[PDB]
Design a binder for this molecule. Structure first.
Ligand SMILES: O=C(O)CCC(=O)c1ccccc1C(=O)O
Ligand SMILES: [Mg+2]
Length: 322
């Protein structure tokens, strides 16, 4: 019957597997925070800004987080605006009020790489809807186009999500596309951020008939959700976006425009990842999310991703700030 508020803040570091790289830079460890709010009821959230993506640092988020909690303890207050903090806190609040739904599915489009032939074998064995993610733009455009074509030709019901991370010039995008049989192009579910500039990405999409998606663009100042020929999806990374409510607004905006919205990982620990999976099952029920990042990390913490065999660090082992 208690309406008594209490809270805890945890600070942590999860070792990454060797060789992880983010935007051509190495990532040794994943630093982050959790918040646990109690009212009589309990809710959790993950506050883990991502170096090189987030504007704020781990340390800054920590400060903002602690201050917000200090306020919440006295009664309801405005959300933080700092995105990682807003996300984690808003999730914790949602759990408290039981407004973040539970989900059946904890799924992710698998991030694929390596030998093309071996990949074919693996894809061939996928059950249900065959959707997979492949990074492009590391090799040269010809190689990427030929390999995508190989994969598409090999498995008629395969749908590939690609990600160029703004790698290409208009010419390189053309060189890539030339190698993909036009009859298969529709099975490129979307190609994230093909070109160096958004204008060029838009030209690519309109000119090649290959669907594109925005990702990084969503976080740039002045971004606007809009219907554009050839734009088929948006990639929403909650941790880099802000509140659960802002996230939901973004999904709604996308849907309103007939775009697919994909909930995507910012390399959160298992805790935040499970929350993303729930957000996805709730808000984007027909779109498998981009959450295949747990396997980059050495351990899970607090909350388990079903099916994972990674070791679990329990709350009692985490550093408490409060
Ligand atoms: O979007 C997903 O499928 C998984 C995560 C992903 O792609 C990503 C995750 C963190 C940082 C950068 C990227 C990326 O877009 O390259
Ligand atoms: Mg991306």
């Amino acid at each position: 019957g208690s309406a008594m508020r209490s809270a805890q803040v945890y600070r942590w570091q999860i070792p990454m597997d060797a060789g992880v790289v983010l935007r051509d830079r190495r990532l040794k460890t994943r630093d982050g925070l959790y918040v646990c709010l109690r009212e009589g009821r309990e809710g959790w959230g993950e506050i883990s800004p991502l170096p090189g993506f987030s504007q704020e640092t781990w340390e800054e988020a920590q400060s903002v987080l602690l201050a917000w909690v200090n306020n919440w303890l006295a009664g309801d207050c405005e959300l933080p605006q700092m995105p990682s903090v807003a996300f984690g806190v808003s999730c914790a609040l949602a759990e408290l009020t039981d407004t973040l739904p539970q989900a059946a599915n904890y799924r992710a489009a698998p991030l694929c790489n390596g030998d093309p032939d071996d990949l074919i074998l693996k894809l061939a064995d996928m059950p249900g809807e065959k959707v997979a993610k492949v990074k492009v733009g590391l090799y040269e455009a010809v190689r990427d186009g030929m390999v995508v074509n190989l994969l598409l030709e090999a498995i008629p019901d395969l749908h590939l999500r690609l990600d160029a991370n703004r790698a290409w010039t208009p010419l390189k995008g053309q060189q890539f596309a030339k190698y993909v049989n036009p009859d298969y192009r529709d099975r490129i579910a979307f190609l994230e951020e093909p070109c160096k500039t958004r204008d060029d990405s838009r030209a690519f999409a309109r000119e090649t008939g290959i669907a594109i998606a925005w990702d990084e663009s969503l976080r740039e100042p002045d971004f606007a959700f809009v219907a554009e020929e050839g734009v088929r999806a948006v990639v929403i990374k909650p941790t880099l976006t802000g509140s659960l409510e802002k996230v939901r607004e973004q999904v709604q905006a996308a849907h309103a425009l007939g775009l697919t919205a994909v909930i995507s990982s910012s390399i959160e620990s298992s805790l935040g990842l499970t929350q993303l999976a729930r957000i996805a099952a709730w808000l984007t029920p027909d779109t498998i999310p981009g959450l295949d990042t747990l396997d980059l990390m050495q351990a899970q913490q607090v909350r388990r991703w079903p099916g994972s065999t990674l070791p679990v660090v329990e709350v009692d082992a985490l550093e408490r700030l409060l």
